[PDB]
Write a protein that binds this ligand. Sequence first.
Ligand SMILES: [Mg+2]
Ligand SMILES: [Mg+2]
Lengths: 106, 106, 1070
Amino acid sequence: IRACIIKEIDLYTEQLYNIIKSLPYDKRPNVVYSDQPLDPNNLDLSEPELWAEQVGECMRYAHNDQPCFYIGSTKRELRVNYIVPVIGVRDEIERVMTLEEVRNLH
Amino acid sequence: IRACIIKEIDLYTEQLYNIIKSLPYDKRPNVVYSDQPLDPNNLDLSEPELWAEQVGECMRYAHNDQPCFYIGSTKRELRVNYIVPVIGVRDEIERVMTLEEVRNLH
Amino acid sequence: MSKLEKFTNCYSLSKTLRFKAIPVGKTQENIDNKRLLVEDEKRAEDYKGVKKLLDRYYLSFINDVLHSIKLKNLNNYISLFRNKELENLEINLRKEIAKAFKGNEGYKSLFKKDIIETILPEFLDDKDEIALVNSFNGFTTAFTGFFDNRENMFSEEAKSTSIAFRCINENLTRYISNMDIFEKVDAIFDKHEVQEIKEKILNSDYDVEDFFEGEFFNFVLTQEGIDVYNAIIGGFVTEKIKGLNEYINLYNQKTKQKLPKFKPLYKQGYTSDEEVLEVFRNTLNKNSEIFSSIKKLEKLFKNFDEYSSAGIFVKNGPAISTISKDIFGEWNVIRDKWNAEYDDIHLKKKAVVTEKYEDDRRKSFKKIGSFSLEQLQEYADADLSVVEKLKEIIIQKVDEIYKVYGSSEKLFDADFVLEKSLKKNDAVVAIMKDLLDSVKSFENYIKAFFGEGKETNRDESFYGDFVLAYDILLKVDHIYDAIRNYVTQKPYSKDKFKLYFQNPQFMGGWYRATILRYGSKYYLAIMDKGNYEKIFESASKKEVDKLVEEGKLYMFQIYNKDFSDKSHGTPNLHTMYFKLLFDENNHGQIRLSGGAELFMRRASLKKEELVVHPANSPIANKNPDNPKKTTTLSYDVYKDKRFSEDQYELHIPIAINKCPKNIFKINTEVRVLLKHDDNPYVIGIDRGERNLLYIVVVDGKGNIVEQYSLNEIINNFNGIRIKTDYHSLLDKKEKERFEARQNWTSIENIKELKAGYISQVVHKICELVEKYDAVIALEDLNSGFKNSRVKVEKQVYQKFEKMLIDKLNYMVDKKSNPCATGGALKGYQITNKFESFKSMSTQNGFIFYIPAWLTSKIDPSTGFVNLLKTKYTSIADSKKFISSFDRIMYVPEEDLFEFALDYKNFSRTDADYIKKWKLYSYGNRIRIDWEEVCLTSAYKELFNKYGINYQQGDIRALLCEQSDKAFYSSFMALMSLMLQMRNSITGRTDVDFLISPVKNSDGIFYDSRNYEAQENAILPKNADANGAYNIARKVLWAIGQFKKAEDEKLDKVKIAISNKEWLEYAQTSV
RNA sequence: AAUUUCUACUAAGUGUAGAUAAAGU
Ligand SMILES: [Mg+2]
Ligand SMILES: [Mg+2]
């Protein structure tokens, strides 16, 4: 179950990368970021570690071509590996957007 | 094992779609096509159903946003769902290219 | 006959061009096969070891020379201390100390080659570290800076970091106060009691009272003397021996009386998340030294009333404003009470309040050392006790500290493990930053109660405990700085080490180093122990490449992205400087002075961390003002590719204008040229609230030649032109800072973005200067304030002024021909070299520093300025206000209200010149949560709502009969917002117009909204354009003053324009 | 998002525009 969960988490973040790569920077969503795989089907809020910020650049790791995302500005150097779009500004997160509500942005 | 295999087969074909969508039509590889998931890690040749032809257009299914590929010309209406790039022209297939030998094409 | 053409070749200047050296051929494996990069890294790592050894030897020498010293002026100090007969004596004492230091027979060796060659390899006598001190044999120059800084302690300049200042200014005061406290706290003692055991266990030879004698201070100069004295003070285990302070605590606990305790004398970056977190846990846990200091200060400030209020003090400065804010309502209440009590003595029965009088009052105030608590109690009101409010606010701060501790129980327990890295984790850094911020806010707050120190009747019963606790607490400053500098740290690093190549005398001239060149490639050839061009005897490329293959040569290639073959745009400035080093048009302007330096930076980013933009994939563009919204490159874009490899940096010094000829004084030549000129332009710069910087160029008669915002920097290239809105970038960064958990990194990002912005504005202002031959006009940052909405703060504006001075020392146009006036070879020198942030005042070559008083809230067409005080205080004050107008009537033709005043009848209105203004209710004003208000309709509404006719005329008498308390409040409110010129909606909506209530000679009120919808406008478009316009008109007044004087009295003409003269100019120029 | 180094970039495709006095403390 752990192998399939990681595969789903990575396919979802690869699709998110391929989507978000083309939106203009002023349209990027507010997301919840981390370094362990993030599972939108089970992700529940009220955890005191989820902070909704906005995606920046979208680049590829040079050694294994894994997508990584810079939260906020690139100059902030807050590079994460797994994100998930949310409707939130702070610790008050409302709901989790889907792979088509992010395409409607532009 | 079947659930993870299908997930890998689909993540691979989604990456292949996202890659092949941007190459000019004269650079597209020669591929082996089918409707059941294709697994490059185990795919063995000499099966009398593998015919290497060239990818055409790359569109999305309107009902569930699943990538589909038109083998040969679009006007031929040979639309498949799972492909795999190969170095071959006929029933004499040499080897299976990778997700970076297809990016080197252009 | 232009002005600038005379200010070339004035004085000399020096720069260092930094480059990158690329090993050519097989130089890198010829270097790795001789290991010429491990000796030097080992030496760079042994530098710190030899630094510590030199520090230890310095400490030995200090404790040696501080043994053979006995002063003859110390008894005079103690006799006269317990305003000018003492400072001469204390500087005599410090001079005596410094002469005792510099008078030894060994001080000569302390900062030359002898201390590495002979002394330190003998003072140590350890075969392990004699290896260290012998490795740096012949490399004494590597310490030149260290020595030049490690001698400022043996001096007497009394700066905060020096041995003399520590021993005298900070120690002798405490020694004298300790003499006092011992004279007071006595006869509770016996030889049978703890007195004899103190002597026996810690001294064993002479009495303990000898350490409170006068002329025995020449015993606590040595660190061991300080140690034994602080031992008998506090207690020193050999059997835990109690000290004098806790004997006092034992007495004050036996019976209840707050008896003073003695004061002890003074004593003369992290690299891993675990180290940082354990330092945090150690210094700031709930049983540390700092938390105990906080508990002690809490018990003190909650026992704050049993200390005599006449003994406490509060320092004079920002602390007074904050104390008034927290106690007496808001910012300025203590200041105005002091000004009232100063007028009641130094002001006659007349209303003759002059700007000179106000300035002398301000100076007398700012010179007051500190305020007692009984004084601040006299300034208070009935039933308000100032000590109770201070105690309650300090207890609130302490309880907030305790609350943050209770919110942060988790970072102290031993089970805690770090999931993510510290720089990427922001919950734990938020916790640490909140704790450090609260604790340092408390520390900076209670810093006030140390009221100047030098004063007579200090309540030592309180100050003993206070300093005992505070001298442990102020370590939070270093902890805060360390943790912050660790968190705000780039993932790469620029740590390098100089390469010598087994040669102490290496590269120091043009040594074994030469600069070759071939075609359009410049090479650095270093001999060890086709056709080129030597720098001009030629060579043969074949045999030099043969030397490179052999090993007899170390050819590097000097390179930056302008020497590339795919570079087509304009080269950098320093690239042009370098290329000119070897040019023909360069005669002696830029020459090669000194020796270069070849450093070496190791790869800081592991190639497993390298992140790339994959090729043939459309990249999004980050510039909203860019037409092209994507980019597809045929190659890869690595992020920070420069820091993922080893790079041989090369620092090359250059001396511009080494042999000047047009030597003269720049300021006086500027004054003479501005005098003899018939139409000198002036560029006024002002810090706005909606614009970062705003430019207004004004000719020699007050006519606006240009006025535009510096919001967007415009880069020209290839004929194309693309703009960048730095205001929007700054707003984005501030929004990100509002979203982030902690804002240590956001603040540094904002600072560096602002630095880049001012680095663009520098070029903007220079190309503005070399277009009109204009003269710049900047706000004098020493005196003035900007009301917290101005984006560019004072620190970054000071950095901007410094950057402008450093640029205008040698102004270059990159696009211009080099040998042409204004090019790199013949740049303009229209400013003197920067000295200090305090000497940036009243002139600098082409730069005039101007006070920003009465520049934005002034009508630019009439000179009007609201000098009234329209704040409601009571019925009587508002009645007198209303009764002070010459006439108040309703003009029915215009449907307005005229308020014919006369500035003679009003207080503090002496600067004005045209004292008889007539101002109407024209237009609409935006009050402040904002609300738009049409003035005449508001007046009619108020009048009708309180039953008042106004068509009569001169309704002043009809108006001061209202008995209601709120009528005059509303009236003075809208009378205050009628005189509000700068109106702006708070919620960022760009409406920053500037209306005036008076009409000019032609009879039309100035309204900026009539000039914002225009290009080629004659009056300011908004309040910030008004600020720049007035900052330019002040320099125009100074130019007129120059025109009034003769060609020898020009140097003495004062140009610090006073409020009287400024208002006179602004009101008659029209 | 490439840089002697900094800022904003991608700016016409291995770069653009401006600035840059390094070392040491
Ligand atoms: Mg350039
Ligand atoms: Mg950058």
